[PDB]
Amino acid sequence: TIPPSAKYGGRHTVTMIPGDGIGPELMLHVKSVFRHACVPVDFEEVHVSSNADEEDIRNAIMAIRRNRVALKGNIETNLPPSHKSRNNILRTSLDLYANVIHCKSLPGVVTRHKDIDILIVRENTEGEYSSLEHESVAGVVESLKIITKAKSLRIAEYAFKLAQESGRKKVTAVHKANIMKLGDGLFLQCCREVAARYPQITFENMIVDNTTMQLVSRPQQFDVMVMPNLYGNIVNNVCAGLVGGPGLVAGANYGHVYAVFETATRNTGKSIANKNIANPTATLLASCMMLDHLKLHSYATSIRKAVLASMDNENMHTPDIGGQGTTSEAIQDVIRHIRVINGRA
Amino acid sequence: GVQTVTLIPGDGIGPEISAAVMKIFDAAKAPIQWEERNVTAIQKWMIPSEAKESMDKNKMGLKGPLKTHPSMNLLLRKTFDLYANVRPCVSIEGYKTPYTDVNIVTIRENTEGEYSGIEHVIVDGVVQSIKLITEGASKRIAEFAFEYARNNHRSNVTAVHKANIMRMSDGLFLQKCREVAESCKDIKFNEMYLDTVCLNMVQDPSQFDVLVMPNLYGDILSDLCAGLIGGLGVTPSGNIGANGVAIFESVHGTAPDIAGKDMANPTALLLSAVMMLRHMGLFDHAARIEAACFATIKDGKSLTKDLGGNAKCSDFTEEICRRVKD
Amino acid sequence: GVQTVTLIPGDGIGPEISAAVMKIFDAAKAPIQWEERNVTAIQGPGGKWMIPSEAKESMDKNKMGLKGPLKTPIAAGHPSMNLLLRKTFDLYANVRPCVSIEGYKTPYTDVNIVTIRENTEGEYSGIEHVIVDGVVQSIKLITEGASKRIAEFAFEYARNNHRSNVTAVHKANIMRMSDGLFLQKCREVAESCKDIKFNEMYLDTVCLNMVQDPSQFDVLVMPNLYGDILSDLCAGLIGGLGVTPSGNIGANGVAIFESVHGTAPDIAGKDMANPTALLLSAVMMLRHMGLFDHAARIEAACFATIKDGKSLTKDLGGNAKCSDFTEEICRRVKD
Amino acid sequence: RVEGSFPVTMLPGDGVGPELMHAVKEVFKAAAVPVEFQEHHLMASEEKLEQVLSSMKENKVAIIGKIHTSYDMRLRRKLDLFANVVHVKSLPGYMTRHNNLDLVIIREQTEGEYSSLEHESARGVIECLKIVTRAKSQRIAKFAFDYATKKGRGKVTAVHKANIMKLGDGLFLQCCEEVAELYPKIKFETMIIDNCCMQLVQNPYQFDVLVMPNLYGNIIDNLAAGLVGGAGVVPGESYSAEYAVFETGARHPFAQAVGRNIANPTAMLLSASNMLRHLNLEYHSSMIADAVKKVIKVGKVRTSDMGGYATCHDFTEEICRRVKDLDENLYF
C-alpha cells in the first residue's frame, strides 16, 4: 500500500505544474486568490517543460505520487519525434482514467445557446493514447489502437456513479459503433452492463456524428455523456465553444487515488503570454474542483461563487469573451467577492 | 443535345423524393435523361452490371438512401474509386439557425483510414483497430482540394489534422498537403488542429472556406457543419472519382418512419443535383434550380416535417416546380 | 588493379584474427591494401546514431569491406552496430556457405550447401510492443519488392558460382499470405533461368531431412522470418561456428565479408584464437573480386593445414596456437 | 481384471494414416488389450468436427494420422491442445549419427504461429501479427516442469530468441524462471534458438527437456526427430486441460509418400503404447513397446526407410509374433 496524502495540520500540499504559455501567470493568481481566501493549501511547484528527456516529467509524476493531487497549466509540444506526449504520460502513467468536464453556460457570458449544463465523462487511458504508429514502407503509415473491456467498464461505472451522486437523470453514451462495429460495440455493451445496475438514471446512446449535430442546434438535451477516448475531442470542444470559449471551461482527470486539475482546453496561449489579457476563470474554476477533491468544499464554494460573480460584470470580461478588462482586474473582482472574517465566509 | 446520366433512387422516401426531383428538374426545362438502375449485392461480391455498364458510359449519377453483406455505399467507393467526398455547407437564406453566415466546403479522403480498417480481437476483452494512411492517397486528396478551390473560386484551404495524437499519420498527410500548396500559391493555405476547428467553428464559422482532412476522424467534422445550416435534409454531397465518374447523393438515412406517406423533404437531392449541373457544366440551369429553392423557403409559404409545417412530398415539390418556370 | 579493401579491426578476438588474415595474405601477397577503420556506434546529430564517416567513405570508394567480430552493443538500449552497417550500405543479402572441411572429422562428411538469407526486412524489421499486462504483440512484414530481389540474387549466385539447382525454403501453410508471396516471386524467377532446377520445401521438411542426409541440398533461399536458424543448424554439420564464413552482399556492388564469431575475450590475446573463419570469410571476398587464382591457393593450404593433423588450433581438437596455424599455411601457399 | 474396454477415439486420417492405424489395430488384437477404437475420419458440412468433439468429450484420448489436407487446426482449438510432446529416443538396433539420445521436446501450441492474424497494407506489403502472452507461457512452463518431474527428468532448457524479441521472448522466460522456482529438484537453463539448433547437431546429449514457444517448436521437433532415425520412428502426443491426442512426431515428413505398404509403423505403435500408459494400462504399454523395440534390434525385419525391404504388412506382423507370448519381461 501507499503513503498518505501530504496533509499534516489541516493543510494539504498539492503539486503545481505551471506549464508553458500563460500557465505561469494564471497559476500565480490562483495562489493570490488562495492566500486571500485562507485556504489550507501550499504549492510544491514542479517544472515540466524541458524537451526530449524524461528527467523532467519523471519528476512531476513522482511529485503527484507524493501528494496525490496537482493543478497544472498546459505543457506545449511542437522530442519532435513520433515519441509520446508529455501531458498524456501523466494521464496514462498515473492511471488518471476519467477526464471529466463541466459545461454550465455562464450567466454573464451570453452566446448563441443558453441553458446548457453538460457533464462529459471521457475515457482517459486507451484508444487514442494507445495508438502505435509505424512506417512499414515509405508512404505507408499504419496505426494500431486498443479498446478493452476493463477500462470501458470503469468509465461507465464512473459515469453513472457520478450521475447518481450529482442527481442527474439522463446518461448518453456517445460512440460510432456503426462504422467500427466490433470495438465501439464492445464499449457500448459495457455501458448497458452498468445502466442496468442504475435503473433510475435514464440510459441512452447516440452516434457521435449525430451528437455533434444535436450539440450545435439543441444541446440542452444532454445530462451526462460518457464516451471512449476517441473522436479526437469534438465533444469536449464543441461544448467548450457553446458555453463561451476555452477560457471558461475547466476539466479534471480523476483516477483511483490520484487526480490532476486543469483547464478543459489544452491551449497554452503563447500568443498572449505576459500581456494580462489571459482569461482566469477556467483555471480558477479548475482549482475549485481541486478543492472539492480535497474535501475543502467551503473554500471551493466561496471561490466559485466569487468566480461566477466576476463573470456577471461586463467590465470584467477579458478579450477572449469580447471585453476589454484584464486578468488583474478580473482577479481583483473575484477577490472582492470572497469576504472572509476570522477565516470563514 | 440531351445529357444521359445514371440514377439510383433507393429505399424509404428515396424513389419518392427522387422522382420528385425529376419533376422539378424537368419543370425547370433542363437537359437530362435518367437511365435509371437499382444496385443490390450478387456473388466475389459485386453489384449489378446494368448500372455499372451504363454509368461507365453515362459517367455522372445521382443517389438516395439505402440500408444494411458488404454494405451498398462501400461497394460504390471501392468499385468506382470515388476517392474524394466533397460536401458544401452553405447556410440557407431563409431557414433561421443561430449560425447565419456559414459557407464551408469539406473535402474528405474516401479511400483510407477507417474505410481500410480491420477490427480484430487480440485476446478476450481486447479489440484492436488497424487503420492505414498512405502518401499517395493524401497527395491525391490534397491536390484535389486546391483544384476544387481554384475551380469554384475559393480563397482559403485549411488542412485539418490532429498531429497531437497521430503525429506520424497526420504528420505525413501534412507533409503532402504542403508540397501541393507550394505549387498553388494562389490559395491561402493554413493547417489547424481538429480540436481548434470545432472550437472556432461553433464560435464563428464564417472564417472557414475549404477544409481538407484525411479520413481518420472522417464524417464528424462535416456533420457538425450541417448542424450549423439546419440539418442533413438540406445538405448536398458528391463523390468525385478516378474514372471520371462522380456520384452525387443525399446523406439522410433510409427514412422508414414515413416511407410513403408523402412526408419527406428533397432539398437534399435537389441541391445534390444543382451541384451536378455545375460539375456537368450547366451553370445557367444551375442558378435557376437553386435560387428557385432558396426563395421557396425564404418566403416561408410552406415548410415540410424537417423544417416544420404541414406540406407533403407533393405539396412542396410542385410548389417549387411552378416557381422555377418564373 | 591493385585493390584496396577496408578492414574493421574486430573487437575482442578481432585483433588476433584480422592481423592473422593479413599475415596469411602477406604469404601470397594478394593485391590488397588494408585500409583499416572501425564502426563503434557513434551517435549522429539528427538523433539516430551514424557510423564512423571515414568508413562510410572508405567503403563507398572501395567496394569490398571485410569485417570481423562486433563488440556486443549491450552498453545501453541503442542501435546495434551490425544493424548500422547493413542498413547504411543496404546490403540486402547474407550468403553463408557450408563445405565439409576434409581434415575436420565430423559425423556429416559430404556437405556442400549454401544458405542465402534475404537480409532486408522480416525479422530485422522488429516492432514488438505491449497491449495489456503480459500480452506482447510482434509486427513483422515481408514485401514483394525485396522478395523477388533475393529470389533474383539467388539464381544469379547459382549461375555465377556454377551451382546445379536451387531450393526455396518457407512455411506456406502456417503463414500462407507472407510466404505464398515469397514463393510467387521465386516461381517467376524460376522460369527466367530454367537451366537451374527449382524446388520448394517446408522449413520443417528441410530440417528433418538435412539432419539425416544433408547431401541433397546446395543452395537454399529463404526469407528473413526464420533467421539464422537454418544456416546455424548447418554450421554444426561441418562442425563449428568458427570454421564457417559469411558475407553480406549489397546493392551498388558494395559488400562486407565477415566472420560470425562472438566477442568472448577469454582466450582473446592468449595467442590461441582460431582465425579459420575470417580467412575463409575473405577467401569468399577474393572470389568476389575476381581473384579466383589468388584465393584457391589460400584455401587448399588452409584445408590441408587442417587435414595435416598437428598444426591445429585448440578450438578444433588440438592444443596449439594461432601462430602455428597461420605460418603452416604461409609455407604451403608456396609450392 | 478389466471388464469391458476403454473407448479411445481414433481419426485415422488421409493417406498412409489408416494403413498405420490398421497396424495399431492388429498389434492391439494380438496384444490382448482391452481398448475399443471408434473412428470419425474428418469442406461441405463439418458436422463431423462436433461429431468428433462429442466423442472426444466422452473418451478424452485419441489417436490421429495427420489429415494431409481449417481442418486439423480448428480441431485442436476446440480441444485447447496447448502442449505438444515429441519423444526423441533412439531405438537400439537402428543406428544413426546420434545414438542413445533421449530427449523430449515440449512446445507450446495455442499461441504464436497458431494465432498471427496476417493482412496486407500496400500492394506488395504483407504484415504478420504474432501474439505472445503470460497466460500461455506460464501454462506451458508449468506443464514442462510437471512433466519433467513426473518422468524423472533432471533438466529443463527453455529455448528462446530474447536477443531479437526483446519483450515477447523476454516475457516467456520470465514465466519459465517464475515456474522454475517451484521445482528446485530440476536444473533450469535457457538457450538461444539459433545456438540450440547447432548444439542439437553437435552435442545433442546435453539436453534433457526442451520447452520452447511455438515458432521454434515446429522446427525443433523435426530437427530432433532426424537425429534419432526419422519421421516414422518418432512418436508424439498433445495435451488439453482434460484431453490427450496421440500421434506421429515429425510433422511434414514427405511432400508425397504415395505407394501402399511401404510406410513404417514404429511411430504409431510407440505413440500408441505411450497412449496405453496414459489409460494406466501400464503393463500392455510396457509390452507393445518391448516388442517393437525388440523387432528392431533383431534386425531381420526392417522397413524400406530403416534399411531392409520388408513391407508394412510384414513389419507389423512380426511385432504381434513377438508380443504373442514370445516376450520375457521377468525382471522385478
Numbering used by the authors:
A (entry chain B): 5 to 82, 85 to 351
B (entry chain A): 3 to 45, 50 to 74, 80 to 337
C (entry chain C): 3 to 337
D (entry chain D): 10 to 51, 57 to 83, 93 to 355
Please give the exact wording used by the authors of the publication that reports this structure.
Among a series of biochemical reactions in the TCA cycle, isocitrate dehydrogenases (IDHs) catalyze oxidative decarboxylation of isocitrate (ICT) into α-ketoglutarate (α-KG) using NAD or NADP as coenzyme. Human (Homo sapien) NADP-IDHs and NAD-IDH are also called HsIDH1, HsIDH2, and HsIDH3, respectively. It is well established that HsIDH3 exerts the catalytic function in the TCA cycle, whereas HsIDH1 and HsIDH2 play important roles in cellular defense against oxidative damage, removal of reactive oxygen species, and synthesis of fat and cholesterol. Mammalian NAD-IDH is composed of three types of subunits in the ratio of 2αː1βː1γ 22,23. We found that the α subunits of both αβ and αγ heterodimers have catalytic activity; however, only the γ subunit plays a regulatory role via an allosteric regulatory mechanism, while the β subunit plays no regulatory role but is required for the optimal function of HsIDH3.
The crystal structure of the β-mutant HsIDH3 was solved at 3.47 Å resolution with each asymmetric unit containing one α2βγ heterotetramer. There are no ligands bound at the active sites, the allosteric site, and the pseudo allosteric site; thus, this structure represents the apo HsIDH3. In the apo HsIDH3 structure, the αβ and αγ heterodimers assemble the α2βγ heterotetramer via their clasp domains, and two α2βγ heterotetramers assemble the (α2βγ)2 heterooctamer through insertion of the N-terminal of the γ subunit of one heterotetramer into the back cleft of the β subunit of the other heterotetramer. Thus, the heterotetramer has a distorted tetrahedron architecture with the two α subunits occupying two vertices on the same side and the β and γ subunits two vertices on the other side. At the interface, the clasp β-sheets of the two heterodimers interact with each other to form a β-barrel in a reciprocal manner such that the clasp β-strands of the β subunit stack antiparallelly onto those of the α subunit of the αγ heterodimer, and the clasp β-strands of the γ subunit stack antiparallelly onto those of the α subunit of the αβ heterodimer. Specifically, the two β and two γ subunits are arranged alternately to form the inner core, and the four α subunits are positioned on the periphery. In particular, residues 10–14 (AKYGG) of the γ subunit make several hydrogen-bonding interactions with residues of the back cleft of the β subunit, which form a major part of the heterotetramer–heterotetramer interface. Structural analysis reveals that the insertion of the N-terminal of the γ subunit into the back cleft of the β subunit pushes the large domain of the β subunit to rotate away from the α subunit (the structure elements moving away from the α subunit by about 1.5–3 Å). Consequently, the αβ heterodimer assumes an open overall conformation similar to that of the αMgγ structure rather than the compact conformation of the αCaβ structure.
